[PDB]
């Protein structure tokens, strides 16, 4: 048998036998994973390198997309292939309704979703006010470090290295150092409060509860660029991440991850450009508009249609 590693975002993997070599499909790979129907429903196989992540179709043959990654990169992006090695991942299905996710109780499905949500938080893809980031930090301390204890946790504990595993990298330098006391206090409170279940899946679910209300939760992210309407040129190039999820469309400044706009389905409309290299958003209810340039335009528009359509 040939085998392939299917990774998760924590860096773990499960090797799966390919019964039809490179003609094995995603559905067959999923069947060969260790998973009940219960755990499986929420997740599918994605192909991802450092700067390009794509959710596969169940009839796709993933080893062929790995094989063709260079053509795919050049069709969808301007990245240097030499810097992008793809792997296959088990990840949240981008079409998973938030209403369906909210009633999950399976502990394995909960930890897989938790790991993915943690990964996005630490990379900076979740925008939230400091109080919410502090609450998520305190939950990670309970999950990862167990019960609070003054001798260990009060002083010299929340240094750089440690803060790095609990706050977004975008807040580590500037903002994070000052949160240390409120994080600790909240952590203390989680431990000291016996009303709060300390079963692992319960705490992980609590972290997820606090992510579900973040507007980019569950987003597939794409890269693009907008041009400012201020002027000089006509005008300045702003690289952006475009987040698409079951809630709507979200633009992030590529460099700082700052949230530029968030638009809910029903409050905007889109049109694909003639060459498939851009799309336009019209925020009716605000009567503003903007154009994102990206070779992933077609993909972004088809996803907006699907996720708007299911809502």
């Amino acid at each position: 048998y040939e085998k392939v590693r299917i990774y998760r975002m924590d860096g773990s993997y499960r090797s799966v036998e390919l019964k039809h070599g490179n003609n094995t499909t995603v559905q067959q790979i999923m069947e060969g994973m260790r998973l009940s129907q219960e755990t499986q429903q929420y997740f599918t196989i994605w192909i991802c390198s450092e700067n390009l992540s794509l959710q596969l179709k169940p009839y796709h043959k993933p080893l062929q997309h790995v094989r063709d990654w260079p053509e795919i990169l050049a069709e969808l992006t301007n990245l240097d292939p030499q810097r992008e090695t793809p792997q296959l991942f088990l990840r949240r299905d981008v079409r998973l309704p938030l209403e369906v996710e909210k009633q999950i109780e399976d502990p394995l499905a909960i930890l897989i979703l938790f790991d993915e949500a943690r990964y996005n938080l630490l990379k900076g893809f979740y925008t939230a006010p400091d109080a919410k980031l502090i609450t998520l930090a305190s939950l990670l301390l309970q999950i990862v470090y167990g019960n609070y204890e003054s001798k260990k946790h009060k002083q010299g504990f929340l240094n750089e290295e440690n803060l790095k595993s609990i706050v977004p990298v975008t807040k580590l330098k500037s903002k994070a150092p000052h949160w240390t006391n409120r994080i600790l206090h909240e952590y203390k409170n989680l431990s000291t409060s016996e009303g709060v279940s300390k079963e692992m899946h319960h705490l992980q679910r609590m972290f997820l509860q606090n992510c579900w209300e973040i507007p980019t939760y569950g987003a597939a992210f794409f890269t693009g660029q907008i041009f400012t309407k201020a002027s000089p040129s006509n005008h300045k190039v702003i690289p952006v991440y475009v987040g698409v999820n079951i809630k709507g469309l979200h633009l992030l400044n590529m460099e700082t991850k700052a949230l530029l706009i968030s638009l809910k389905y029903g409050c905007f409309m889109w049109q694909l450009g003639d060459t498939d290299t851009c799309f336009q958003i019209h925020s009716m209810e605000n009567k503003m508009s903007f154009i994102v340039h990206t070779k992933q335009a077609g993909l972004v528009v088809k996803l907006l249609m699907k996720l708007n359509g299911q809502l």
Partner: peptide, 5 residues
């Protein structure tokens, strides 16, 4: 071939 999501 090229239809994702």
């Amino acid at each position: 071939r090229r239809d994702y999501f």
